[PDB]
Design a protein around this ligand. Structure first.
Ligand SMILES: Cc1nc(C)c(-c2ccnc(N)n2)s1
Lengths: 258, 296
């Protein structure tokens, strides 16, 4: 019920502007591509499943990856070392007990050594200047979930599922703040499951009208539609679990009424 | 590093050694926290990753100031503002005489301001205890050691096996809840308030169950009237003995009515009803707060 739901929400809104990656960055990367990013992020989803990491850790690792590639050129043969150091750091920040470093070497198939992973840890902390506490879609969604009437398990799981899909495609999704992406997933999850719409209490809080979310909602709906065909399927497979009420099996709405 | 001249060891924290040091160029005295960096082991400790990311965001008069982070190949140093000593040491020095009431109230007021600042920026400190609370000779007191602090943009899951303090642990954590909330920091500050007041720890338990039982003998064994849900909590047992709530006047004798009312509010069983730092700061106990200095 906190006296600071408001204050934290306002503060998160401030912080997400400051932890934003550069939207243009992939086109300044001479050796890597949206498509390799996509493979890397998909692989991290699987690592999160295999080690039973929280969803928040995955979202933080992606944020770290994008901010690091916004300032440093990296060669395709090193991008997985960036991803592994980001996952380790996000696990240290967010997890109760993070997997050991040796485990993060093993997940790459011993393609890097322990010392390499650790030196990349140091270098990521330096580039990111130790700012690790970045807002994420997951965090905005969590707050948004209080304004449900009444609370719906499937709505929440499917909003999470859609929020994760947006990590995979820099593509468009680098264009939108996490609060807007969270805005669009919540609405689209609500609509899909119940036919309701972005609630007025959330309109007042976020200052986002349903209309202002339209550009991002059209991207997300197309992604949802195209998901079963996408070259990357780890989030799908993950969200067929019953833990998640199998939501990724549900049939997306062919239209949004917007 | 090259502009600092180590003066003397002052403590160990989470990750540890703290030295008093002097900036040879500006004269500033600082506390340098050196992390011992094994670069074949686990790299930077999660305590340090959290304390630096969170402290870098918290600028407030009652939170310790991180001035700089010196981050080289084999060593990591945190540079903090220097403060004279920790509340534990001051309480030990003030045993026998006791800390004056006006100073207690100033420290409490200041701590509640630091915590309200932490919580409104989604930081849970999680380990408040007198050793983590630093004082200066000008009457200030600051929260320090954010090694175990967590961002709660998403709720913070509890540690099965918990290497946080035992004496300052909230009963919801003892009874096995799934998440922390900001209430656990109010509960600890309440313990410390009473400890300054009586000059001894309120709930000095020796194990998880002992600790629950000391709480129960002072506050009464909780039930669903006081704390809806308690009896369905994972570690709750119907065989718990049924103790009576004790009069606050026996618990903290020196305290006036307003202080007994705020302490009973910081020590509410139900973390949903336990007072927030923001609201504590409105309490009438504070209407007449001053800024006395410690006799150090
Ligand atoms: C962790 C910390 N442990 C100590 C002892 C810290 C500190 C910071 C500033 N001044 C002093 N004496 N100590 S910060």
């Amino acid at each position: 019920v906190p006296d600071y739901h408001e204050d934290i929400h306002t503060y998160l809104r401030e912080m997400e502007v400051k932890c934003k990656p550069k939207v243009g960055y992939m086109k300044k990367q001479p050796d890597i591509t949206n498509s390799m990013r996509a493979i890397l992020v998909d692989w991290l989803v699987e690592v999160g499943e295999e080690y039973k990491l929280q969803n928040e850790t995955l979202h933080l690792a992606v944020n770290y990856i994008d901010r690091f590639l916004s300032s440093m050129s990296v060669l395709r043969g090193k991008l997985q070392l960036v991803g592994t150091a980001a996952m380790l750091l996000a696990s240290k920040f967010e997890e109760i007990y993070p997997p050991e470093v040796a485990e993060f070497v093993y997940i790459t198939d011993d393609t890097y050594t322990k010392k390499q992973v650790l030196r990349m840890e140091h270098l990521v902390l330096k580039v990111l200047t130790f700012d690790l506490a970045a807002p994420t879609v997951n965090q905005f969604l969590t707050q948004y979930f209080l304004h449900q009437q009444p609370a719906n398990c499937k709505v929440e799981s499917l909003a999470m599922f859609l929020g994760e899909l947006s990590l995979i495609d820099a593509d468009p999704y680098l264009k939108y703040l996490p609060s807007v992406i969270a805005g669009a997933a919540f609405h689209l999850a609500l609509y899909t499951v119940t036919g309701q719409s972005w609630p007025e209490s959330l309109i007042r809080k976020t200052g986002y009208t349903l209309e202002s979310l339209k550009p991002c909602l059209m991207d997300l709906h197309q992604t949802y539609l195209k998901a079963p065909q996408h070259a990357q399927q780890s989030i799908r497979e993950k969200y067929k679990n019953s833990k998640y009420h199998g939501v990724s099996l549900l049939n997306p709405p062919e239209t949004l009424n917007l | 590093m090259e502009n600092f001249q180590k003066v003397e060891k002052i403590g160990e924290g989470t990750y540890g050694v703290v030295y008093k040091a002097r900036n040879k160029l500006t004269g500033e005295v600082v506390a340098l926290k050196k992390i011992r960096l094994d670069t074949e082991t686990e790299g930077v400790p999660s305590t340090a990753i959290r304390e630096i990311s969170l402290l870098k965001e918290l600028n407030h008069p009652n939170i310790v100031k991180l001035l700089d982070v010196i981050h080289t190949e084999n060593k990591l140093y945190l540079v903090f503002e220097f403060l004279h000593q920790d509340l534990k040491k001051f309480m030990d020095a003030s045993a026998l005489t006791g800390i004056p009431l006006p100073l207690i109230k100033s420290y409490l007021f200041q701590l509640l301001q630091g915590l309200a600042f932490c919580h409104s920026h989604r930081v849970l400190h999680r380990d408040l205890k007198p050793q983590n609370l630093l004082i200066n000779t000008e009457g200030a007191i600051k929260l320090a050691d954010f090694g175990l602090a967590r961002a709660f943009g998403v709720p913070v899951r509890t540690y099965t096996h918990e290497v946080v303090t035992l004496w300052y642990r909230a009963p919801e954590i003892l009874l096995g809840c799934k998440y922390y909330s900001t209430a656990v920091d109010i509960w600890s500050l309440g313990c410390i308030f009473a400890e300054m007041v009586t000059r001894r720890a309120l709930f000095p338990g020796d194990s998880e169950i002992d600790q629950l039982f000391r709480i129960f003998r002072t506050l009464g064994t909780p039930d669903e009237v006081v704390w809806p849900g308690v009896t369905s909590m994972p570690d709750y047992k119907p065989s718990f003995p049924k103790w009576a709530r004790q009069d606050f006047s026996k618990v903290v004798p020196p305290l006036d009515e307003d202080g007994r009312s705020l302490l009973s509010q910081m020590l509410h069983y139900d973390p949903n009803k336990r007072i927030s730092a923001k609201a504590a700061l409105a309490h009438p106990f504070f209407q007449d707060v001053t800024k006395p200095v410690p006799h150090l």
